Design an enzyme around this catalytic site. Structure first.
Site, PDB file in Angstrom:
ATOM      1  N   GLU A   1       0.946  -1.025   0.210  1.00 23.71           N
ATOM      2  CA  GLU A   1      -0.039  -0.141   0.032  1.00 23.71           C
ATOM      3  C   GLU A   1       0.838   1.312  -0.181  1.00 23.71           C
ATOM      4  O   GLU A   1       1.833   1.115   0.771  1.00 23.71           O
ATOM      5  CB  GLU A   1      -0.868   0.055   1.244  1.00 23.71           C
ATOM      6  CG  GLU A   1      -0.348   0.055   2.531  1.00 23.71           C
ATOM      7  CD  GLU A   1      -0.382  -1.074   3.310  1.00 23.71           C
ATOM      8  OE1 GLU A   1      -0.398  -1.995   2.696  1.00 23.71           O
ATOM      9  OE2 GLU A   1      -0.105  -1.220   4.421  1.00 23.71           O
TER      10      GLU A   1
ATOM     11  N   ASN B   1       2.371  -6.288  21.682  1.00 23.00           N
ATOM     12  CA  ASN B   1       2.127  -4.842  22.119  1.00 23.00           C
ATOM     13  C   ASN B   1       1.668  -4.648  23.465  1.00 23.00           C
ATOM     14  O   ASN B   1       1.841  -3.873  24.173  1.00 23.00           O
ATOM     15  CB  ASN B   1       1.183  -4.274  21.062  1.00 23.00           C
ATOM     16  CG  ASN B   1       1.699  -4.066  19.657  1.00 23.00           C
ATOM     17  OD1 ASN B   1       3.075  -4.177  19.441  1.00 23.00           O
ATOM     18  ND2 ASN B   1       1.060  -3.883  18.695  1.00 23.00           N
TER      19      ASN B   1
ATOM     20  N   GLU C   1      27.821 -13.731  17.450  1.00 23.96           N
ATOM     21  CA  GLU C   1      27.974 -14.480  18.714  1.00 23.96           C
ATOM     22  C   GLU C   1      26.717 -14.344  19.524  1.00 23.96           C
ATOM     23  O   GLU C   1      26.682 -13.828  20.613  1.00 23.96           O
ATOM     24  CB  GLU C   1      29.016 -13.702  19.529  1.00 23.96           C
ATOM     25  CG  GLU C   1      30.371 -14.051  19.044  1.00 23.96           C
ATOM     26  CD  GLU C   1      31.793 -13.572  19.765  1.00 23.96           C
ATOM     27  OE1 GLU C   1      31.209 -12.813  20.435  1.00 23.96           O
ATOM     28  OE2 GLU C   1      32.711 -13.904  19.540  1.00 23.96           O
TER      29      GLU C   1
HETATM   30  N1  LIG Z   1       4.492  -2.541  17.561  1.00 23.71           N
HETATM   31  C1  LIG Z   1       3.704  -2.025  16.608  1.00 23.71           C
HETATM   32  N2  LIG Z   1       2.741  -2.840  15.887  1.00 23.71           N
HETATM   33  C2  LIG Z   1       2.301  -2.354  14.642  1.00 23.71           C
HETATM   34  C3  LIG Z   1       2.337  -1.146  14.224  1.00 23.71           C
HETATM   35  N3  LIG Z   1       1.620  -0.653  13.045  1.00 23.71           N
HETATM   36  C4  LIG Z   1       0.904  -1.819  13.014  1.00 23.71           C
HETATM   37  N4  LIG Z   1       1.273  -2.861  13.827  1.00 23.71           N
HETATM   38  C5  LIG Z   1       0.667  -4.207  13.783  1.00 23.71           C
HETATM   39  O1  LIG Z   1       0.270  -4.559  12.761  1.00 23.71           O
HETATM   40  C6  LIG Z   1      -0.713  -5.598  12.866  1.00 23.71           C
HETATM   41  C7  LIG Z   1      -1.933  -5.276  11.407  1.00 23.71           C
HETATM   42  O2  LIG Z   1      -0.941  -5.235  10.365  1.00 23.71           O
HETATM   43  P1  LIG Z   1      -0.466  -3.729   9.757  1.00 23.71           P
HETATM   44  O3  LIG Z   1       0.890  -3.574  10.356  1.00 23.71           O
HETATM   45  O4  LIG Z   1      -1.220  -2.751  10.237  1.00 23.71           O
HETATM   46  O5  LIG Z   1      -0.295  -3.970   7.972  1.00 23.71           O
HETATM   47  P2  LIG Z   1       0.354  -5.131   7.461  1.00 23.71           P
HETATM   48  O6  LIG Z   1       1.121  -6.065   8.414  1.00 23.71           O
HETATM   49  O7  LIG Z   1       1.662  -4.472   6.578  1.00 23.71           O
HETATM   50  O8  LIG Z   1      -0.493  -6.015   6.668  1.00 23.71           O
HETATM   51  P3  LIG Z   1      -1.362  -5.115   5.526  1.00 23.71           P
HETATM   52  O9  LIG Z   1      -2.744  -4.554   6.377  1.00 23.71           O
HETATM   53  O10 LIG Z   1      -2.290  -6.250   4.722  1.00 23.71           O
HETATM   54  O11 LIG Z   1      -0.788  -4.365   4.766  1.00 23.71           O
HETATM   55  C8  LIG Z   1      -1.791  -4.874  14.131  1.00 23.71           C
HETATM   56  O12 LIG Z   1      -2.221  -5.820  14.642  1.00 23.71           O
HETATM   57  C9  LIG Z   1      -0.561  -4.202  14.795  1.00 23.71           C
HETATM   58  O13 LIG Z   1      -0.303  -5.403  16.005  1.00 23.71           O
HETATM   59  C10 LIG Z   1       3.468  -0.197  14.902  1.00 23.71           C
HETATM   60  O14 LIG Z   1       3.603   0.765  14.744  1.00 23.71           O
HETATM   61  N5  LIG Z   1       4.065  -0.677  16.215  1.00 23.71           N
HETATM   62  N1  LIG Z   2      40.805 -11.152  31.918  1.00 22.71           N
HETATM   63  C1  LIG Z   2      40.447 -10.694  30.724  1.00 22.71           C
HETATM   64  N2  LIG Z   2      39.716 -11.578  30.023  1.00 22.71           N
HETATM   65  C2  LIG Z   2      39.477 -11.595  28.788  1.00 22.71           C
HETATM   66  C3  LIG Z   2      39.880 -10.137  28.014  1.00 22.71           C
HETATM   67  N3  LIG Z   2      39.508 -10.093  26.655  1.00 22.71           N
HETATM   68  C4  LIG Z   2      38.852 -11.361  26.660  1.00 22.71           C
HETATM   69  N4  LIG Z   2      38.715 -12.141  27.726  1.00 22.71           N
HETATM   70  C5  LIG Z   2      38.314 -13.417  27.994  1.00 22.71           C
HETATM   71  O1  LIG Z   2      37.880 -13.977  26.610  1.00 22.71           O
HETATM   72  C6  LIG Z   2      36.801 -14.693  26.809  1.00 22.71           C
HETATM   73  C7  LIG Z   2      35.745 -14.357  25.591  1.00 22.71           C
HETATM   74  O2  LIG Z   2      36.587 -14.943  24.547  1.00 22.71           O
HETATM   75  P1  LIG Z   2      36.566 -14.017  23.180  1.00 22.71           P
HETATM   76  O3  LIG Z   2      36.440 -12.736  23.581  1.00 22.71           O
HETATM   77  O4  LIG Z   2      35.165 -14.623  22.290  1.00 22.71           O
HETATM   78  O5  LIG Z   2      37.981 -14.684  22.466  1.00 22.71           O
HETATM   79  P2  LIG Z   2      37.997 -14.322  20.617  1.00 22.71           P
HETATM   80  O6  LIG Z   2      36.689 -14.798  20.091  1.00 22.71           O
HETATM   81  O7  LIG Z   2      39.210 -14.970  20.440  1.00 22.71           O
HETATM   82  O8  LIG Z   2      38.014 -12.884  20.649  1.00 22.71           O
HETATM   83  C8  LIG Z   2      35.945 -14.145  28.266  1.00 22.71           C
HETATM   84  O9  LIG Z   2      35.671 -15.326  28.926  1.00 22.71           O
HETATM   85  C9  LIG Z   2      37.187 -13.313  28.973  1.00 22.71           C
HETATM   86  O10 LIG Z   2      37.439 -13.956  30.150  1.00 22.71           O
HETATM   87  C10 LIG Z   2      40.596  -9.288  29.093  1.00 22.71           C
HETATM   88  O11 LIG Z   2      41.092  -8.127  28.589  1.00 22.71           O
HETATM   89  N5  LIG Z   2      40.844  -9.350  30.293  1.00 22.71           N
END
Ligand SMILES: Nc1nc2c(ncn2[C@@H]2O[C@H](COP(=O)(O)OP(=O)(O)OP(=O)(O)O)[C@@H](O)[C@H]2O)c(=O)[nH]1
Ligand SMILES: Nc1nc2c(ncn2[C@@H]2O[C@H](COP(=O)(O)OP(=O)(O)O)[C@@H](O)[C@H]2O)c(=O)[nH]1
Ligand SMILES: Nc1nc2c(ncn2[C@@H]2O[C@H](COP(=O)(O)OP(=O)(O)OP(=O)(O)O)[C@@H](O)[C@H]2O)c(=O)[nH]1
Ligand SMILES: Nc1nc2c(ncn2[C@@H]2O[C@H](COP(=O)(O)OP(=O)(O)O)[C@@H](O)[C@H]2O)c(=O)[nH]1
Ligand SMILES: [Mg+2]
Lengths: 99, 430, 50, 436, 439, 430
Positions: free
Chosen positions: E71, E206, E254
């Site tokens: 739309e 919501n 991750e």
């Molecule tokens: N959280 C949130 N939900 C929304 C919002 N706008 C629409 N909705 C949800 O969308 C549902 C209805 O679908 P719409 O988003 O209005 O329209 P559509 O999903 O594009 O589908 P059509 O009506 O066919 O165009 C409602 O039940 C709402 O829950 C919004 O701004 N915030």
């Molecule tokens: N003590 C300490 N531990 C660290 C530090 N940076 C990362 N780690 C360790 O690294 C682990 C997470 O691993 P990650 O960051 O994913 O390693 P990578 O994937 O090789 O970068 C955590 O459990 C931390 O204990 C640091 O500056 N100090």
């Protein structure tokens, strides 16, 4: 300013340049030797001269489609005078002196 | 004495030319006008090598330019250092080759040998004690390989005692510029093996591989690729033009790098090269020179020098340095990598030292080596050729201007045999 | 030549060179006289003094 | 010493020729009168499309032909009256009216004589003529009949010299006439055996290109000319500008014609971005090339995916460095939605020219720094020949409109031979593509 | 060298993308027309913004986002609003006819002609990025075009790109509050379609967020704009680690390797803390223990689901501000000590922590306060089975009499697609039941 | 001479690099610019042990930084002392890790390993006489463990005699830093035990425990924890660099600390440590020094050291000190706590003297010992590993990149086996 000439030391792509027309080998000598001390003689004026035609009717409603789009390009106006070489205009002119 | 004369062929041949003379002119101190302004006596000591004296003080290159279409000789003479090429030697027809290995080597080239052959003979007659010829020609270009090979085929016919050298730019597999690249690839090679004393392979794929990874410059250009190659050719013969410790003339290069008659293709490269961001933080000592020389990424060829074994190699040290480390360091490389070097050629590295360094640096080295890896290049070129020939694709363009497909079949047998023969010794043992 | 040396069972190289040697009609024609008739088949080629 | 003589026939040829000439005029600085302001000197690149008169003006090495005098007259009275040679715009006294037989056997022979004389003189001055560019319309009687006869004579007298033709076959579903299937099919035999290279320029495909990008909902034929104008601009631009990697006209029939019969390739053009928003994307060479292969931007109305690619050669112009081109080309192979034929491993002919694209006054194209044009011969081309196949057979079923061709002197049986030529041509396209 | 692409389809998707992109523009200092503020003049800006924006070479920035809808009303509103010059003109794809809450329409009749343009735009966006982390999709499930085009694009992207990670911030209907009448039908159909095509799905009904607004923000008459602002804040807290330095970084990749025990179990409910109106913030000291205990409050959940009725499978929480690791450890130990919060037996370690230095930014005219500490908590639990059970019951109550089916069977989809969706939901409930039993 | 090179992987591995070279840089007196402003030659007597030489006197770290994701690597560059490392030593991928061992050890890390092995091989061969390596990688991360451990595995194969120093970070159950940490831990140890020689397990709990009960500071970042460890590393390497009573390198440390071939997991700590408000009353003497060194709470491993029996341990004092007051103290401790030391190895504590105390202090100590208390870590990891595997939960991922089930069963048995042996010595009596 005799900078050390080594690879990657002087950029080549001349971003500052604009025109890249290819000068032919034939006139290569033309821009270095011939035209240095020479001239296509002149287009001089004349003392006694004493205007193109009307071109007054250019209606816009009856404008042919093939003309209203391709207007005179690069010209201030769609001039009408018929060009002629240098020798053509100045036929049979003369000057005289006594010494 | 013992000077040489250059013959460049094809557009690729002309552009590559536009640089080395420029660089060659730079080292000798020859200004664009031809007026000498060097600083020491050395630059003029061996000027005969690449120039003949002409009344008026400006120096005439012994250059002969050949190309089937006038454009190349047009632009080459228009830009910087383009006026040093003297107009008499320019030779050009009126047609152009259109990448047709047939067109540039039987149709048009065959008709033109007269003038170009006449001029080259005279220039060779000019030199006191001839040394040889250098050639720049494009294998993937129809005219270059076409016109180029015939003369090379013709040249060896009359100079039986002159060494012949040929720099070649074979098309890489990754990025291609011409669709007829496979066909003209083999035909030029077949004729190249039978006549050339030394042909050097340079892969455009590597250069861009060299530029991005080492030079780290944002926007290269063919001028840059020309820059790299142009340095190398000056690298091979540099020591000859200047006094030095161990003079190593180009012929001496032939002595120590050709194992058997039919294996006369090598791979080369230039170094060291620094970055826009690494030039100040690297090291400048002999180990750096040897470390990068054998590095895989520096060789100008697409073939990795580790897939096979080096049958022989030569390193031409340029500039001053302690010879101790030059010889010893090679002894460092040979021992730790025996498996990669055949075991029946002891002390299989050549070394030379030249006393004149490049303008602006202290140390320099250029490398030339014949390695088994080169088999990789011919196979892929060989493999591609079989792919298109079984279907007779694009066969008519060559069949309709005097040729028979028997020659194409004949070319494959020799090319295939060289590939097979070149690899026979890899499995051989003592 | 190509499919010619295979035609008469002769080496490829010799034929090409053999072609040049016969080619020099000028040298045998530059001198005076010596009219010729080169036919070798469908068409005949004749020459008087010049 | 490079010369290319343009041959035009038919209103589609003339108007397309008309528009393309303004583009060539502005690029070299040629004023409408015929005198170059210029001022240095040298830079005689204008020779490729012009010839010096010894002293003074310059002329286009072109010949304009037609049988209906009205169209030619407008150029003779327009802004460009001061440019062309008065005695090279041949005009007749009667039109053909889509009776292709009329333009081949009745009315044409009274004009062929003069046209051959004209091509005689224009080439005489040149030195290394590369070939001819022939622009024509097949969807018309007078244009095609002269379009056919002229092609035949060019081979006979000259022979091996190059020839290129940008024909415009009728659209898939949009048509201007109702007799095109006869004139469209019967021309094919005429153009298949005589021209080395020819390109499709189906009109309704361009309407899609113009509508999708330029954002003009009310285009006209004039804008259609310009897009074709740029296409020729890039293909020939390599011959009159210095660059890092050149290409020649002779070097196209040797990278795009695997065999004598298969000589039809499609074009494409990009970028085409309206200046209204052109600068909301970076115009990088990486993004520019991808637009080339995109099915929505193909110049001729055929989906390239339905078959395999045989050989595509792309010409680059602008500030593109070859380092970019090498990387981008690799990408096109990688994608799993575009594939190459079994027996063509390498099929690219890449050309680069530094000179940027010239933006004509009064046009719609914006100003960008890079552009690439693709000329590829692909299996997808079967569609155009497939679709014209049905129309000719069906409408011929009951001898509809045949009676206008019988009485003009054209043999009824000749149409028997023509249909086979498509059959012969149709079978090869399928035959080549099958895997080995 | 790390970028993400966000996909917004449906009216809800567009209205939440607006709130996301105003916040993203504000956080990096980019004014609405796309350029950097004119005086600027500090010089040398660090280009963190590459993650969401793209540089045109000189001047403006083009966001890496695409809007879809059938739309034209919302798209025209976007093209006439303050952000008209921000987005690229041709990445706002719009249709002509609405889906009219019919899933079969936007999935079989009219949604097929927009998918090609959308996929083309996605492809043209992808090649610019070199470190593409993954895709984000926003779509309201209880709608026709939303669910239909979301399912279609997810199905196409699963085969076009393959292993690239995709995250979905979908919005299911509230347990009793709803605007439509046929929402269970397309809700179940879309859930079945995305069950095997989405890596992570986040519950965003919501009613829960309305309760959050009323209870904490002291707003008695909230509107959709506040809802979208909170959703955008959650997005920012989730993706802040990719463009701001921190003590312990986390990536998009991750996330779905640490909260997905088995491939079928990838639905989880979110929470955010603190959500306080300044009237009260002035009184409290909002320390890290307080915010991390508030994150686990069942009344503070972003979904209308009670975690007290089920076990936890994996819990991931990301911190930003001036938090120190020692206090985070001390609070996590206290939470593990608490008896009212229990984990599943085969998951001894159930926490992943992310630490970032950039404090949350405040949008002018917003409701939230400016604070130095905040946490975004994403946990997978067994308690999500109840919403599926309720949706299945509501669906069955109508499907027993085949009500409203002709609106679906007449538009290209067969009669049997309801039955297989019901079986898939039954299998999902069975799996969620089996996963929780003690070994 | 007998110099070493460093390679680090993972954010924890990388982060330590930023601090690690910071303290080492200052100890010899290296400034942010890197120019040498050292006061005494004692700072340069053995400078090459950790730095090379280049033009201008700038000294470059022997650094090799490698990771899967660039973001963490980006940060290390912009901080202080972020300009020492050279770009060539750097490497980075494009897909990331995702804390999944599979993507770090079989599929992703496989493609990039070529560069590091090449870069690692460049540094080693250049050095005079390579002495060993120090690997600082994290077991709790995907790219860390996967690329990390595989890096340890490959290196040993090519090098027969090189010694290895490995500093790891085992995850403690309380601070659940990654739910997939248990699986990763068991996989890492399995590969480690077969090639790693020396490994020092440091529990993040101690770093947190240390930061509160030892230093008494309010708000530490990971820099402080990074700060604490960095002291330990320099603590062990100093003796190899400076003059001393009894010089002792890393290898000399190994021979006295690993009683059996594969009981080689050690325990390290630092002292003396005191707070801002409690560092004025105590008396700074080694007798007070030793007291804080043996105390369990200060030890940097969550494994209580009083629940096991010490097998081997080493003492590396720093600063000046007479032989008596250190040796007599050590003899005192051995006898006064007999029940805590094994009976079939007498005089089982090593001591050494280093003549350069840390800058800004008067005395300090660094301790490394093999204690059975480390058995607490593996079993508790052992118990956790079995818990998650009995339901196959999270097992699918590892199977998604070519892995297979029996690998996990094999790894579990060995770790169950490794714990089995490490305790049979505890009850052994002479
Ligand atoms: N959280 C949130 N939900 C929304 C919002 N706008 C629409 N909705 C949800 O969308 C549902 C209805 O679908 P719409 O988003 O209005 O329209 P559509 O999903 O594009 O589908 P059509 O009506 O066919 O165009 C409602 O039940 C709402 O829950 C919004 O701004 N915030
Ligand atoms: N003590 C300490 N531990 C660290 C530090 N940076 C990362 N780690 C360790 O690294 C682990 C997470 O691993 P990650 O960051 O994913 O390693 P990578 O994937 O090789 O970068 C955590 O459990 C931390 O204990 C640091 O500056 N100090
Ligand atoms: N590209 C393009 N093609 C055109 C244009 N105008 C006409 N044509 C083509 O011309 C075809 C019909 O032929 P005509 O335009 O009548 O020209 P013709 O073939 O010489 O026939 P006559 O008009 O009798 O001379 C149509 O099918 C169109 O494809 C145009 O402005 N641009
Ligand atoms: N690296 C590099 N390669 C070049 C250059 N000029 C030509 N080539 C190579 O030559 C091939 C084209 O040769 P071509 O121009 O057709 O040769 P021609 O027949 O003499 O015109 C391309 O594939 C390029 O790889 C250059 O300046 N640099
Ligand atoms: Mg007409």
């Amino acid at each position: 300013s005799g900078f050390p000439k080594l690879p990657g030391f002087v950029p080549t792509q001349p971003i500052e340049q604009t025109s890249f027309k290819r000068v032919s080998a034939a006139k290569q000598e033309y821009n270095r030797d011939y035209l240095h001390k020479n001239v296509p003689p002149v287009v001089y004026p004349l003392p006694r001269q004493v205007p193109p035609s009307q071109k007054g009717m250019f209606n816009p409603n009856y404008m042919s489609t093939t003309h209203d789009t391709y207007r005179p390009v690069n010209c201030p106006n769609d001039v009408t005078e018929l060009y002629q070489p240098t020798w053509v205009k100045m036929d049979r002119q003369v000057l005289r002196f006594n010494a | 004495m013992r000077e040489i004369v250059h013959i460049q062929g094809g557009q690729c041949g002309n552009q590559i030319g536009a640089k080395f003379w420029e660089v060659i002119s730079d080292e000798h101190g020859i200004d664009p006008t031809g007026t000498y302004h060097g600083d020491s006596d050395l630059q003029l000591e061996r000027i005969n090598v690449y120039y003949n004296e002409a009344t008026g003080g400006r120096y005439v290159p012994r250059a002969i330019l050949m190309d089937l279409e006038p454009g190349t000789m047009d632009s080459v003479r228009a830009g910087p250092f383009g006026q040093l090429f003297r107009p008499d030697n320019f030779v050009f027809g009126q047609t152009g080759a259109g990448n047709n290995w047939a067109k540039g080597h039987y149709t048009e080239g065959a008709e033109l040998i007269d003038s170009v052959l006449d001029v080259v003979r005279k220039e060779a007659e000019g030199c006191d004690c001839l040394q040889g010829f250098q050639i720049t020609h494009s294998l993937g270009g129809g005219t270059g390989s076409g016109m180029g090979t015939l003369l090379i085929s013709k040249v060896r016919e009359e100079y039986p005692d002159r060494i012949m050298e040929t720099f070649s730019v074979v098309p890489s597999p990754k990025v291609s510029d011409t669709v007829v690249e496979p066909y003209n690839a083999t035909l030029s090679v077949h004729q190249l093996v039978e006549n050339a004393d030394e042909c050097m392979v340079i892969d455009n794929e590597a250069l861009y591989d060299i530029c991005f990874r080492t030079l780290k410059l944002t926007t290269p250009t063919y001028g840059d690729l020309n820059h790299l190659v142009s340095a190398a050719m000056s690298g091979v013969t540099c020591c000859l033009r200047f006094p030095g410790q161990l003079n190593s003339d180009l012929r001496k290069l032939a002595v120590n790098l050709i194992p058997f008659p039919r294996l006369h293709f090598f791979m080369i490269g230039f170094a060291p090269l620094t970055s826009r961001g690494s030039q100040q933080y690297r090291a400048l000592t002999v180990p750096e020179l040897t470390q990068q020389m054998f590095d895989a990424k520096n060789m100008m060829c697409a073939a990795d020098p580790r897939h096979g074994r080096y049958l022989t190699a030569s390193a031409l040290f340029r500039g001053r340095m302690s010879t101790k480390e030059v010889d010893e360091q090679m002894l460092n490389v040979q021992n730790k990598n025996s498996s990669y070097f055949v075991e029946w050629i002891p002390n299989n590295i050549k070394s030379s030292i030249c006393d004149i360094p490049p303008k602006g640096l202290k140390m320099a080295v250029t490398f030339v080596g014949n390695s088994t890896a080169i088999q990789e290049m011919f196979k892929r070129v060989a493999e591609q050729f079989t792919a298109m020939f079984r279907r007779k694709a694009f066969l008519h363009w060559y069949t309709g201007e005097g040729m028979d497909e028997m020659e194409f079949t004949e070319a494959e047998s020799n090319m295939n045999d060289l590939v097979s023969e070149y690899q026979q010794y890899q499995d051989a043992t003592a | 030549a190509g499919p010619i040396a295979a035609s008469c069972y002769l080496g490829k190289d010799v034929v090409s060179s053999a072609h040049n040697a016969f080619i020099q009609a000028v040298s045998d024609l530059t001198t005076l006289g010596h009219g010729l008739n080169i036919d070798f088949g469908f068409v005949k080629v004749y020459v008087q003094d010049r | 010493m490079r010369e290319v003589i343009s041959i035009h026939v038919g209103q589609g040829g003339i108007q397309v020729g008309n528009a393309c000439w303004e583009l060539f005029c502005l690029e070299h600085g040629i004023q409408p009168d015929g005198q170059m302001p210029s001022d240095g000197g040298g830079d005689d690149a204008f020779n490729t499309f012009f010839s010096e008169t010894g002293a003074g003006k310059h002329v286009p090495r072109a010949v304009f032909l037609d049988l209906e005098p009205t169209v030619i007259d407008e150029v003779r009275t327009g802004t460009y009256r001061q440019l062309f040679h008065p005695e090279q715009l041949i005009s007749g006294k009667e039109d053909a009216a889509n009776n292709f037989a009329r333009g081949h056997y009745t009315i044409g022979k009274e004009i062929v004589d003069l046209c051959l004389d004209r091509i005689r003189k224009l080439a005489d001055n040149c030195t290394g003529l590369q070939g001819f560019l022939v622009f024509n319309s097949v969807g018309g009687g007078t244009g095609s009949g002269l379009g056919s006869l002229l092609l035949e004579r060019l081979s006979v007298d000259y022979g091996k010299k190059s020839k290129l033709g940008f024909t415009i076959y009728p659209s898939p579903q949009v048509s201007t006439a109702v007799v095109e299937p006869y004139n469209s099919i019967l021309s094919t035999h005429s153009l298949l055996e005589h021209t080395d290279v020819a390109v499709m320029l189906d009109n309704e495909a361009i309407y899609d290109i113009c509508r999708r990008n330029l954002d003009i909902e009310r285009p006209t034929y004039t804008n259609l000319n310009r897009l074709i104008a740029q296409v020729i601009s890039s293909l020939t631009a390599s011959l009159r500008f210095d660059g890092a990697l050149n290409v020649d006209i002779t070097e196209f029939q040797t990278n795009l014609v695997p065999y004598p019969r298969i000589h039809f390739m499609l074009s494409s053009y990009a970028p085409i971005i309206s200046a209204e928003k052109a600068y909301h994307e970076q115009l990088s060479v990486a993004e520019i090339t991808n637009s080339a292969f995109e099915p929505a931007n193909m110049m001729a109305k055929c989906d390239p995916r339905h078959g395999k690619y045989m050989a595509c050669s792309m010409m680059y112009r602008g500030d593109v460095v070859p380092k970019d081109v090498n990387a981008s080309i690799a990408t096109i192979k990688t994608k799993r939605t575009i594939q190459f034929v079994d027996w063509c491993p390498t099929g690219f002919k890449v050309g680069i020219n530094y000179q940027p694209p010239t933006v004509v006054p009064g046009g719609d194209l914006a100003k960008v720094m890079r552009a690439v044009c693709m000329i590829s011969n692909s299996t997808a081309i079967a569609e155009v020949f497939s679709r014209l196949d049905h129309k000719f057979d069906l409408m011929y079923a009951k001898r509809a409109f045949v009676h206008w061709y019988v009485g003009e002197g054209m043999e009824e049986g000749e149409f028997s031979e023509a249909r086979e030529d498509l059959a012969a041509l149709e079978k090869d396209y399928e035959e080549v593509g099958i895997e080995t």
